[PDB]
């Protein structure tokens, strides 16, 4: 873990109130599960390692990083209070990709495939009970 990469997003903080909701359970069991196993998931399964990729400007451009490895930790370690927080994390991850990369770059096509799946699943996010 290089000093030239930022610290990853917070995934543990006892002072932040936590809750299980049926919607968060769906995000873990249906949404994350579906996206994680996708053929195009691998660039998104951990924070962008700008040193290893030789992208020294990455964290100059992307000031709100997010990735599915972080989201998986947040879901598995009950970090969230509600589904909107987690949906926002997914949307941040996609937008980072679209902002940093050229349209039509392979990673953008990969992100777009995952986002299409994401949208289908979120359209079916259950009513909160």
């Amino acid at each position: 873990g290089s000093h030239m990469n930022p610290p990853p997003p917070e995934t543990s903080n006892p002072n932040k109130p936590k809750r299980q909701t049926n919607q968060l359970q769906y995000l873990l069991r249906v949404v994350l599960k579906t996206l994680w196993k996708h053929q195009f998931a691998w660039p998104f399964q951990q924070p962008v390692d700008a040193v290893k990729l030789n992208l020294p400007d990455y964290y100059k451009i992307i000031k709100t990083p997010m990735d599915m490895g972080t989201i998986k930790k947040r879901l598995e370690n009950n970090y969230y209070w509600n589904a909107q927080e987690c949906i926002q994390d997914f949307n941040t991850m996609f937008t980072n990709c679209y902002i940093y990369n050229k349209p039509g770059d392979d990673i953008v096509l990969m992100a777009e495939a995952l986002e299409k799946l994401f949208l289908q699943k979120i359209n079916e996010l259950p009513t909160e009970e």
Side-chain angles (χ1 to χ4, degrees):
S2 174
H3 80 289
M4 296 195 334
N5 287 314
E10 191 176 71
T11 53
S12 175
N13 186 339
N15 294 317
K16 181 185 189 299
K18 313 299 203 311
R19 172 180 77 140
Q20 217 30 263
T21 75
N22 67 311
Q23 296 184 324
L24 282 163
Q25 285 156 8
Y26 178 94
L27 282 160
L28 176 57
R29 297 192 231 236
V30 177
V31 181
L32 182 68
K33 188 194 68 93
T34 290
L35 273 61
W36 189 267
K37 68 183 174 71
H38 196 280
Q39 183 174 241
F40 293 162
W42 62 270
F44 304 102
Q45 287 173 332
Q46 60 286 311
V48 174
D49 183 337
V51 171
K52 197 165 193 191
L53 292 166
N54 190 27
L55 300 175
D57 73 340
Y58 185 84
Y59 292 110
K60 186 73 194 173
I61 305 312
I62 297 306
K63 298 297 191 188
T64 61
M66 188 48 59
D67 64 280
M68 294 202 296
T70 299
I71 293 167
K72 178 178 178 292
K73 284 176 189 84
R74 288 178 171 195
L75 286 166
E76 293 177 349
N77 303 323
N78 307 286
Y79 179 79
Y80 294 119
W81 186 261
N82 63 42
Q84 190 44 57
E85 290 174 281
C86 178
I87 291 167
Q88 178 58 251
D89 287 345
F90 279 101
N91 283 323
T92 296
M93 179 183 77
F94 296 125
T95 59
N96 292 348
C97 183
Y98 303 146
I99 290 178
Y100 184 75
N101 300 280
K102 294 181 182 152
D105 276 358
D106 283 341
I107 198 175
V108 173
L109 292 167
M110 295 166 89
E112 285 173 340
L114 300 169
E115 186 184 14
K116 177 173 183 185
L117 287 175
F118 179 73
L119 181 53
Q120 281 171 22
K121 298 303 192 201
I122 292 306
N123 285 348
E124 290 289 7
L125 178 79
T127 308
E128 184 182 4
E129 71 209 15

